Amino acid sequence: CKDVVVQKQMAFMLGRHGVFLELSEDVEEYEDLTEIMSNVQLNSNFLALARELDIMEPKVPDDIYKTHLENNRFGGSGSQVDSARMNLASSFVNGFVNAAFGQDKLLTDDGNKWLYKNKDHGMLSAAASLGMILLWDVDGGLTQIDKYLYSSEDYIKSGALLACGIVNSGVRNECDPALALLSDYVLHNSNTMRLGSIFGLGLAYAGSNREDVLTLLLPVMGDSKSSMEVAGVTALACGMIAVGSCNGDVTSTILQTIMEKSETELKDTYARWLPLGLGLNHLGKGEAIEAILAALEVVSEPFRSFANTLVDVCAYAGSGNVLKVQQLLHICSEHFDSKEKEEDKDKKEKKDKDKKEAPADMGAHQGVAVLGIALIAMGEEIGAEMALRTFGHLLRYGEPTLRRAVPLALALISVSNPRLNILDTLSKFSHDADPEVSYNSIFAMGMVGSGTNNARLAAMLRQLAQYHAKDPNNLFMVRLAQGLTHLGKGTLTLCPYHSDRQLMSQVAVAGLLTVLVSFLDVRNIILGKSHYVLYGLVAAMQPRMLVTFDEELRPLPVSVRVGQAVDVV
Amino acid sequence: APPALWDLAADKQTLQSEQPLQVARCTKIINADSEDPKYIINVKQFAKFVVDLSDQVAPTDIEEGMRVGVDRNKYQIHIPLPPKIDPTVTMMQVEEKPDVTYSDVGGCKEQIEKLREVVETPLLHPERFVNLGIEPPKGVLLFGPPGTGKTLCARAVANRTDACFIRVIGSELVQKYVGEGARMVRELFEMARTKKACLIFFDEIDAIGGARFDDGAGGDNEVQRTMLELINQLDGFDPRGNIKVLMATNRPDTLDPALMRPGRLDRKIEFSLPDLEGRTHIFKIHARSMSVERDIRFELLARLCPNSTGAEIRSVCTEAGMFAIRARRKIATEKDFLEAVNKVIKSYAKFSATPRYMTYN
Amino acid sequence: EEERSKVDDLRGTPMSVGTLEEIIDDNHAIVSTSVGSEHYVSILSFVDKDLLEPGCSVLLNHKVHAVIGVLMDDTDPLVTVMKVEKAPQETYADIGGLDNQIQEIKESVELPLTHPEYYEEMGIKPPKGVILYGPPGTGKTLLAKAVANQTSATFLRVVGSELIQKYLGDGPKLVRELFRVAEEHAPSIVFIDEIDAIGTKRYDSNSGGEREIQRTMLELLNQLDGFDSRGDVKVIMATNRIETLDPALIRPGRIDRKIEFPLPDEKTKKRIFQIHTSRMTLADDVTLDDLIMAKDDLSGADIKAICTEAGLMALRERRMKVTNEDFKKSKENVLYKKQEG
Numbered sequence A: 001c002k003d004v005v006v007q008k009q010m011a012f013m014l015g016r017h018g019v020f021l022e023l024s025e026d027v028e029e030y031e032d033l034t035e036i037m038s039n040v041q042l043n044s045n046f047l048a049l050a051r052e053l054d055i056m057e058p059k060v061p062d063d064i065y066k067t068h069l070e071n072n073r074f075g076g077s078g079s080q081v082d083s084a085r086m087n088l089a090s091s092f093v094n095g096f097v098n099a100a101f102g103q104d105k106l107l108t109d110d111g112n113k114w115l116y117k118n119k120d121h122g123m124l125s126a127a128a129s130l131g132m133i134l135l136w137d138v139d140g141g142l143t144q145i146d147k148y149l150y151s152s153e154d155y156i157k158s159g160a161l162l163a164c165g166i167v168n169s170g171v172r173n174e175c176d177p178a179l180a181l182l183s184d185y186v187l188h189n190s191n192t193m194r195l196g197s198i199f200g201l202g203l204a205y206a207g208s209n210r211e212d213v214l215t216l217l218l219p220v221m222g223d224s225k226s227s228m229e230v231a232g233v234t235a236l237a238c239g240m241i242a243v244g245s246c247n248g249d250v251t252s253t254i255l256q257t258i259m260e261k262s263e264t265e266l267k268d269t270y271a272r273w274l275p276l277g278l279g280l281n282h283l284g285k286g287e288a289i290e291a292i293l294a295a296l297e298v299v300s301e302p303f304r305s306f307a308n309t310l311v312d313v314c315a316y317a318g319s320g321n322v323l324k325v326q327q328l329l330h331i332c333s334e335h336f337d338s339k340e341k342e343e344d345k346d347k348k349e350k351k352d353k354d355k356k357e358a359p360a361d362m363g364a365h366q367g368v369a370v371l372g373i374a375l376i377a378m379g380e381e382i383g384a385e386m387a388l389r390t391f392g393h394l395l396r397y398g399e400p401t402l403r404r405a406v407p408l409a410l411a412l413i414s415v416s417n418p419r420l421n422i423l424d425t426l427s428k429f430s431h432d433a434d435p436e437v438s439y440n441s442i443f444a445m446g447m448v449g450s451g452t453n454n455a456r457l458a459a460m461l462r463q464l465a466q467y468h469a470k471d472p473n474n475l476f477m478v479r480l481a482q483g484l485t486h487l488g489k490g491t492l493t494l495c496p497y498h499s500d501r502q503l504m505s506q507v508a509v510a511g512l513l514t515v516l517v518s519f520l521d522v523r524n525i526i527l528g529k530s531h532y533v534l535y536g537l538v539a540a541m542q543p544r545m546l547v548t549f550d551e552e553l554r555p556l557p558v559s560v561r562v563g564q565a566v567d568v569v
Numbered sequence B: 001a002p003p004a005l006w007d008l009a010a011d012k013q014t015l016q017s018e019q020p021l022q023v024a025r026c027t028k029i030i031n032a033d034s035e036d037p038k039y040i041i042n043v044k045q046f047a048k049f050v051v052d053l054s055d056q057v058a059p060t061d062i063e064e065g066m067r068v069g070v071d072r073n074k075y076q077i078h079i080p081l082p083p084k085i086d087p088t089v090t091m092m093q094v095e096e097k098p099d100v101t102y103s104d105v106g107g108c109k110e111q112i113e114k115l116r117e118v119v120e121t122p123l124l125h126p127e128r129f130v131n132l133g134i135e136p137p138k139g140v141l142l143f144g145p146p147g148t149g150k151t152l153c154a155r156a157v158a159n160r161t162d163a164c165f166i167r168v169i170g171s172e173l174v175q176k177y178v179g180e181g182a183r184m185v186r187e188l189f190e191m192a193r194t195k196k197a198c199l200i201f202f203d204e205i206d207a208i209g210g211a212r213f214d215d216g217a218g219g220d221n222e223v224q225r226t227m228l229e230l231i232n233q234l235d236g237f238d239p240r241g242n243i244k245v246l247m248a249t250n251r252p253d254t255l256d257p258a259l260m261r262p263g264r265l266d267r268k269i270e271f272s273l274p275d276l277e278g279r280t281h282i283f284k285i286h287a288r289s290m291s292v293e294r295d296i297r298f299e300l301l302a303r304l305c306p307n308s309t310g311a312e313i314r315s316v317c318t319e320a321g322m323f324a325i326r327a328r329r330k331i332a333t334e335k336d337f338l339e340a341v342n343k344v345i346k347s348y349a350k351f352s353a354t355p356r357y358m359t360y361n
Numbered sequence C: 001e002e003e004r005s006k007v008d009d010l011r012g013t014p015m016s017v018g019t020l021e022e023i024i025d026d027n028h029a030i031v032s033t034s035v036g037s038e039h040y041v042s043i044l045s046f047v048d049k050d051l052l053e054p055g056c057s058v059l060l061n062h063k064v065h066a067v068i069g070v071l072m073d074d075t076d077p078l079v080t081v082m083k084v085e086k087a088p089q090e091t092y093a094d095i096g097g098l099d100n101q102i103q104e105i106k107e108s109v110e111l112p113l114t115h116p117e118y119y120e121e122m123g124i125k126p127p128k129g130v131i132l133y134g135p136p137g138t139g140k141t142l143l144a145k146a147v148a149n150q151t152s153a154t155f156l157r158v159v160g161s162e163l164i165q166k167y168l169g170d171g172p173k174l175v176r177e178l179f180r181v182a183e184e185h186a187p188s189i190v191f192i193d194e195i196d197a198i199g200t201k202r203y204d205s206n207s208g209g210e211r212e213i214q215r216t217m218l219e220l221l222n223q224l225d226g227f228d229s230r231g232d233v234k235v236i237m238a239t240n241r242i243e244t245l246d247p248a249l250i251r252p253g254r255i256d257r258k259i260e261f262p263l264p265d266e267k268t269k270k271r272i273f274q275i276h277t278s279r280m281t282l283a284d285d286v287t288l289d290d291l292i293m294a295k296d297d298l299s300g301a302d303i304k305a306i307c308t309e310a311g312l313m314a315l316r317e318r319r320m321k322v323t324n325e326d327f328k329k330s331k332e333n334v335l336y337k338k339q340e341g
């Protein structure tokens, strides 16, 4: 039947999904989102067996999130799957509008949500959304305010100038009084310490909505930068604090404000963080800020353009057009950078998602070999790992020092079952004298290993902190290994904060300073006392955090301020 | 195979590091100090050597009875070894990982509270008791009916804040070939003192607490050594011992340990055991299992089984669904299982009523 | 490849087999070999250092006392006593009259493991085992339920208190290792029959004493209670007289189920004779009514032994069919046996 003649066998006539699994033949599925409309009765198990048919497959019914697409069809059918019942619609609708940080779903879906008229926008825009879920988070929290932060205010300024600002960022939220302490302090301009502070400036009021994006970007031009730690911090602010803007003013405002400061940016330190204010909110955004930021490429420095052009060019958009990276490869390369091209095929391989094209894209497998690490990292997103054969074959077959890069692929595929394999493998990589594979190991576990806790983790923390080695890798190992006990959970409700106080209080008796101990004591309570956000994963809907992969790629060769740029978190 | 490939490929650096320190054999105990440079040392080889030390180790760090490494060629001291005692009996004594959280309590309030403040609060807020001291108590004693022996300790396991504690089984103290218990009881104390406030708990002290004397023949002599060496090492003045104590048994016997405890111990509590209004609490914990019909009354069933502690009513909830599987019922109706519950209390009371109250009486 | 031709030159040719004493966080391990020798071994290969743990056997390369590979060798005294197997041809279908008795224990032993779907969804979980007993000398008839259990999963039978108290102890440690070895073979069934620890009169060889016997039994309870092990190693206890055992043993186990063995009636005894004589050939004149009427309070093995002696006597005449006169004359032999003293 499927060989040459006719078409549409009993498979459309009979109703068997078991043979419908076998009805399809190898073809691109981006078009296969369509089916005969049957009753919601046959549509429910139709969609279940189609789903479980489609999970192995790169593309899943969850595609409505990532894709792009972007046509009005998935919003129409997306609000029609709960059509027409508006009462029991409470789930998949309210949780979807209040669980959305960005404006696109509530926007296209806003035009696709025909319940009432013009007053559905009250449950939209994430004002009452983030307000309600934020007060239920206060219902399920919370973090200490007066005791810790004022007892720390007796200690005046810590020497790290590093991790202390993001405290008042995620903590408060929303209150003004500590916001003028944030600001008025960071007017001194010291280092990049302004970072988490001005991040609390707009994160406070923007916790619900909108907010602060009026005075959020004023310090940008207010503060030539001449570098990121000065006028680029607040320049990052409105871009990352955006989280759904656009709206649409914040788009043209960010593009405008960065087109103001160009030679002083210049191509390097701030251009790292700007595309994060666009691509997050919209992938198929019509605005091209890549070209205008890519005219500055002429500085010719191969070094800073590694970590610069990496997520500089990857962070503009998800694209999906196959054309974009061809453009930017030809106009960028020209030639070639002999270096960036690595990251550019990495950006291509990024553009599409898990198409299975990546295992065909690793055949190069350069002496650079960073193609293979991120190529297998992102190149397969699938529930079943199945990547153990190659993920182990590339470390067993691979050239030296590439195994340093190898554990970094533990970020994506490990979301399923990290407990067995991660502390297994990396447990051997942990006591290795190499600070690079110790650092990239404790990160390799890192956040994906912070999903849940265990007695093996807390018991293992011992003598991880008894080592006599110097350098930040020690308390990144141990102190990052502290944040894996729980995430945004507590303290009232639930786990006591006294034990952390005693652990970070006793370990800090050493060195004596060694200011990195006054950096670690705040490091664990970034995520520890931050709270107010549950993750979970981020995320449960199967998106991904964009600041985490980006930032965690730079300190792999961690040197000076890259760790604080990553400390935006 | 890849991990074993990289595992076997590190032997090239390992053999270069194999030249030094591999002659460190063996471990040797020192004896006396005649002067500063020269020390007499004994080894298990039976040859006692008087020898100096390496210049990389401060001589003030070596104290009598410290085991140290040796370069057999020169016999000089190489590196000291902190661990000394003991073989596998210690590692068997150590326990780790939590279980049985506080939500597993059967309604006991004053009990669990008064024992919470003896152990958990002193190590939770040490500065508090030191400020307002006075001084925290030494420890407690548990005993009585079986429900619920020994599970209350599991609560301290899950509620342990940071450093794990060690549990000990009673009958392993007494052993054939008398004189093994002497080493046994002694070593764990030093281990505990290195363990900075770690807890040591002996179960069923009545086995090793046989008191007091009989005509002949001993008999209790090998027993009395165990208990009395215990109490003597417990009554030492240094520290002693900061590791606190924890004790549990069945009957209050015998008199010798019972007369020795109130000087060194305090807070003896008795079970309690389910109160009438408290019996339902065990039903509230077991209600999360299976499915409870909204018409089931726990207070009605609870009065029909006095003195059953928590075990027997656990078997009540158990036989509900057990006999429901045989009758294919998915949920257990209140009238269905009670017909087998009066039977399961009476039929098991027919041969024996389980008179733990009579065991010590 | 090249690693196999490399590491072999380091360990060989001669090497010694020592024991691990203690491990140091410096990757220096202290080994002990015959006789009374110590050392610092640091090797990064083949380890497996975390799974070793002190108290296990390690190799020693002559130069210098290095451990190339790990060795777990059993053998061992206790591991020999669990196997094998039997997997006996007998089944629970070869016994009758205990259907009302057997239904619950057969259910209880197949409750976990096999047929888990109705067990796991119900959330009951009573994994404390079962307790058996009966009169007058039965308990092997309850073992006739263990043969069916031997057909499923893993089985181990440890019977008699002589194995502990025959010499000085060290008390339960012999049982303590049975728990853990059964944990390595989990799931497995551990059956204990005829517990005389409190019913014995004279200890074997020279050992003491009555109260130390009790303390090894009590430590058996705490092992069995227990804190803290969830593993099975399902445990079954059985004896002739339950009154000897202390009520201190019942709350930890078995709190859910204990069975009593009743004496068989006329219908049951008829079934029993049926099952044994199924394979045997009997004369036409043998009737099953008068046989069970003449017998009073007899178990399956009694009617078994009378048939065995009937066939033994029939071997004197070399006859495979047992006549009723030969059967009754043979029956009178065991009848006179129990009635002689």
Ligand SMILES: Nc1ncnc2c1ncn2[C@@H]1O[C@H](COP(=O)(O)OP(=O)(O)OP(=O)(O)O)[C@@H](O)[C@H]1O
Pocket: B104, B105, B106, B107, B143, B144, B145, B146, B147, B148, B149, B150, B151, B249, B250, B273, B274, B282, B309, B310, B311, B314, C225, C226, C251, C252
């Ligand atoms: N009041 C109660 N609350 C909660 N659980 C209970 C209670 N009484 C009994 N139990 C449960 O019954 C189980 C059986 O108790 P167990 O037999 O371990 O006591 P025991 O240790 O034998 O007592 P003893 O040590 O005094 O002989 C325990 O696991 C316990 O959790």
Ligand SMILES: Nc1ncnc2c1ncn2[C@@H]1O[C@H](COP(=O)(O)OP(=O)(O)OP(=O)(O)O)[C@@H](O)[C@H]1O
Pocket: C094, C095, C096, C097, C098, C137, C138, C139, C140, C141, C144, C194, C268, C271, C272, C275, C299, C300, C301, C302
């Ligand atoms: N209803 C029955 N059907 C078939 N066989 C039975 C039945 N009842 C008992 N038997 C058999 O009778 C035997 C009775 O064993 P018996 O009680 O004589 O052993 P025992 O010698 O007393 O064991 P121990 O000395 O260890 O107590 C069992 O092996 C069982 O197979």
